[PDB]
Amino acid sequence: KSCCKSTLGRNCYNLCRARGAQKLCANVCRCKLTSGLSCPKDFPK
Amino acid sequence: KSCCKSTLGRNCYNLCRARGAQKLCANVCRCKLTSGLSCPKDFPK
Amino acid sequence: KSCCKSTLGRNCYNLCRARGAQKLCANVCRCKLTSGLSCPKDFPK
Amino acid sequence: KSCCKSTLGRNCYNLCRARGAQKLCANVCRCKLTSGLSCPKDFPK
């Protein structure tokens, strides 16, 4: 699951995924990938 | 597939998975992960 | 995809998968695992 | 996702996948595998 800090980072990640991998997109859009089924409180977007 | 020993361990695993990986949750909730499509007799929950 | 040589090997594999991994079950039931979407002529079951 | 350069390469890849892996089929049919959800402009088929 990807978990972003802001709505900005969420749009960033989704657009990035058109051509990039999860892991690279998470980094550039300041998002976090988690193994859990829910996002932490601090990465709710 | 995850296979737990008790109902307690099952609730434990399911809640744990909100933020943890299968493998760490199995350990802490005393469950077992199997490659089979069914659970052994001793981990039926 | 699993591809078996006989119907016997097919029942064997399916039952085996209740508790075993694809790779171990293929071996014991004399089946083959393929990356292709179809089975070879010689493993049609 | 697989992304091919021509329709020819697309038919090539799809037929190849009946018996081959993604990675080998991409190579022989001159296609590219991408982690992105969309294909680059130069591999649109």
Side-chain angles (χ1 to χ4, degrees):
Chain A
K1 210 182 171 45
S2 46
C3 300
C4 299
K5 316 195 205 200
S6 58
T7 67
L8 211 53
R10 170 63 57 189
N11 276 44
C12 177
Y13 179 90
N14 292 357
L15 268 206
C16 176
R17 290 283 290 127
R19 308 265 149 77
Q22 309 187 138
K23 282 207 207 275
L24 164 81
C25 289
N27 281 109
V28 170
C29 301
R30 299 157 85 100
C31 301
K32 262 193 161 41
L33 290 179
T34 180
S35 285
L37 292 139
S38 278
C39 286
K41 54 153 162 76
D42 54 332
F43 281 88
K45 302 288 183 177
Chain B
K1 210 182 171 45
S2 46
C3 300
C4 299
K5 316 195 205 200
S6 58
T7 67
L8 211 53
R10 170 63 57 189
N11 276 44
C12 177
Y13 179 90
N14 292 357
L15 268 206
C16 176
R17 290 283 290 127
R19 308 265 149 77
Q22 309 187 138
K23 282 207 207 275
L24 164 81
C25 289
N27 281 109
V28 170
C29 301
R30 299 157 85 100
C31 301
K32 262 193 161 41
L33 290 179
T34 180
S35 285
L37 292 139
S38 278
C39 286
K41 54 153 162 76
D42 54 332
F43 281 88
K45 302 288 183 177
Chain C
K1 210 182 171 45
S2 46
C3 300
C4 299
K5 316 195 205 200
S6 58
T7 67
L8 211 53
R10 170 63 57 189
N11 276 44
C12 177
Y13 179 90
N14 292 357
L15 268 206
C16 176
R17 290 283 290 127
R19 308 265 149 77
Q22 309 187 138
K23 282 207 207 275
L24 164 81
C25 289
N27 281 109
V28 170
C29 301
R30 299 157 85 100
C31 301
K32 262 193 161 41
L33 290 179
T34 180
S35 285
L37 292 139
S38 278
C39 286
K41 54 153 162 76
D42 54 332
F43 281 88
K45 302 288 183 177
Chain D
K1 210 182 171 45
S2 46
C3 300
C4 299
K5 316 195 205 200
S6 58
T7 67
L8 211 53
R10 170 63 57 189
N11 276 44
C12 177
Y13 179 90
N14 292 357
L15 268 206
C16 176
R17 290 283 290 127
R19 308 265 149 77
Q22 309 187 138
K23 282 207 207 275
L24 164 81
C25 289
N27 281 109
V28 170
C29 301
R30 299 157 85 100
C31 301
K32 262 193 161 41
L33 290 179
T34 180
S35 285
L37 292 139
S38 278
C39 286
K41 54 153 162 76
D42 54 332
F43 281 88
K45 302 288 183 177

